[PDB]
């Protein structure tokens, strides 16, 4: 939230002010869990199986 | 000689911005009327937020920060939260004192509502000993601040005797509350049960001691 | 850092005169001034004037100028706000503020005024102890009932005041003349009766101190 690089850190919206949340709680899926492959600001890189 | 005007209640949700402003009747509030931000949690608790229009005073979250917004002076909570509750006062300079505004009531979404903890205590023995009985019922920790206590001696809803102090917030934003039915020694011997009964956002609660 | 603590809330009949101070805590008193704030019941707040911890001397809002007197003991970084020839319609809290910032920073904790004609009246302590039979719960609430006082206030600690978590205290009321009062405080289920458990009541307009240790009924 104060603008600085932080792997293990997410920053999302929170009636109308700016909240810190955890990498580890971040999830993708489609019919089974994917793996994440990478991330950064708006952008998710993952593996997911036919869904 | 002057009149602030301040909104009278604004209601958000956590996470949102809202704007309070501060209007002066002689004509648009400039720099040299030093607008002040007080804010007065429940206690007469008071704090101040920003001075000299846009000073936030130490130790004040940055999600509060003052301006003039037109001809008026303006507070605006970026992300507002559960704990910015509270009535917020604005002060006016003019030229040689200040005039408050009447305040204004914000209310933040949060606080999951919290039943009451109530408790009923018989009349003391040392105050048998007077000719009286007073049975305390005591309620706690409710949220949304609003309760109703209704007794009932022997199966029958007493109706007279009783005193009902007005919720209270505590500390932690949560409220409390005790109510007072007072016998005699005399009422007290002669009845035999008695119950004070709480209702809070729709369940009730039922306490009942028995002589 | 900064701590504006004010003095208890009194108790006058009209036509008194009461001496408020605020003893100030954290700044250095001659570089930022005093502010008397009057926040009325209903009404809101009002600027009752300023003092200038230099020099000494008040400004007074023109609403306050006559029975309202502002000086400070500035040896001992107090300022305090005397209201001579009470009138009846000075019930209200009355908080100091510090001036810095173009408004104001830090406001104080109030003191309360209750202008009232009445005698005084010492209060009954009643220790509140749970019902005669069971109570098991992994917790526990006892309580204290402070009634039929005048004026007010009354003091009220748990244990000399070393425990506070856990305690509500409830707002005094007057009913049939006098004002009753009340706390209670919860712990866990070990605690008591096992190691003591007291009321500290004081009523300072008549001298009067009472310890009530919480009895098990039976």
């Known amino acids: 939230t104060d603008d600085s690089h932080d792997w293990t850190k997410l920053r999302y919206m929170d009636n109308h002010m700016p909240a810190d949340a955890e990498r580890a709680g971040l999830f993708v899926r489609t019919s089974a869990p994917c793996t994440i492959t990478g991330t950064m600001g708006h952008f998710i890189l993952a593996r997911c199986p036919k869904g | 000689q002057a009149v602030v005007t301040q909104e009278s209640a604004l209601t958000t949700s956590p996470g949102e911005t809202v704007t309070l402003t501060c209007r002066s009747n002689?004509?648009?509030?400039?720099?040299?009327?030093?607008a002040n931000w007080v804010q007065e949690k429940p206690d007469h608790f008071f704090t101040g937020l920003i001075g000299?229009?846009?000073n936030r005073r130490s130790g004040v979250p940055a999600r509060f920060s003052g301006s003039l917004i037109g001809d008026k002076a303006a507070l605006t909570i970026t992300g507002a939260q559960t704990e910015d509750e509270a009535i917020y006062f604005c002060?006016?300079?003019?030229?040689?004192?200040?005039?408050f505004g009447g305040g204004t009531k914000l209310t933040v979404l949060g606080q999951p509502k919290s039943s009451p903890s109530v408790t009923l205590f018989p009349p003391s023995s040392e105050e048998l000993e007077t000719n009286k009985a007073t049975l305390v019922c005591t309620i706690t920790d409710f949220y949304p601040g609003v309760v109703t206590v209704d007794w009932k001696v022997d199966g029958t809803p007493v109706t007279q005797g009783m005193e009902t102090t007005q919720p209270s917030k505590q500390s932690n934003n949560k409220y409390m509350a005790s109510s007072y039915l007072t016998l005699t020694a005399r009422a007290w011997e002669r009845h035999s049960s008695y119950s004070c009964q709480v209702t809070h956002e729709g369940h009730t609660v039922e306490k009942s001691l028995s002589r | 850092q900064i701590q504006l603590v004010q003095s208890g809330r009194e108790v006058k009949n009209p036509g008194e005169t009461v001496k408020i101070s605020c003893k100030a805590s954290?700044?250095?008193?001659?570089?930022?001034?005093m502010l008397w704030v009057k926040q009325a019941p209903g009404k809101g707040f009002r600027w009752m004037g300023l003092?200038?911890?230099?020099?000494?001397?008040?400004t007074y809002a023109e609403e306050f100028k006559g029975r309202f007197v502002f000086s400070l003991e500035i040896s001992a970084s107090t300022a305090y706000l005397q209201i001579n020839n009470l009138t009846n319609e000075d019930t209200a809290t009355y908080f100091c503020?510090?001036?810095?910032?173009?408004?104001?920073?830090?406001w104080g904790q109030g003191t309360t005024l209750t202008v009232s004609s009445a005698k005084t009246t010492a209060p009954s302590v009643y220790p509140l102890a749970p019902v005669c039979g069971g109570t098991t719960g992994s917790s526990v609430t006892l309580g204290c009932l402070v009634k039929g006082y005048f004026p007010e206030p009354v003091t009220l600690t748990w244990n000399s005041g070393s425990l506070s978590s856990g305690v509500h205290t409830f707002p005094a009321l007057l009913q049939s003349g006098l004002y009753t009062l009340s706390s209670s405080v919860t712990v866990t289920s070990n605690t008591w009766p096992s190691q003591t458990i007291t009321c500290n009541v004081a009523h300072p307009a008549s001298s009067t101190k009472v310890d009530k240790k919480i009895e098990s009924r039976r």
């Open positions: 503020v510090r001036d810095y910032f173009i408004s104001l920073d830090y």
């Open positions: 954290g700044y250095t008193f001659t570089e930022y001034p």
């Open positions: 003092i200038y911890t230099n020099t000494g001397e008040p």
């Open positions: 002689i004509g648009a509030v400039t720099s040299s009327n030093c």
């Open positions: 000299d229009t846009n």
């Open positions: 002060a006016l300079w003019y030229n040689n004192l200040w005039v």
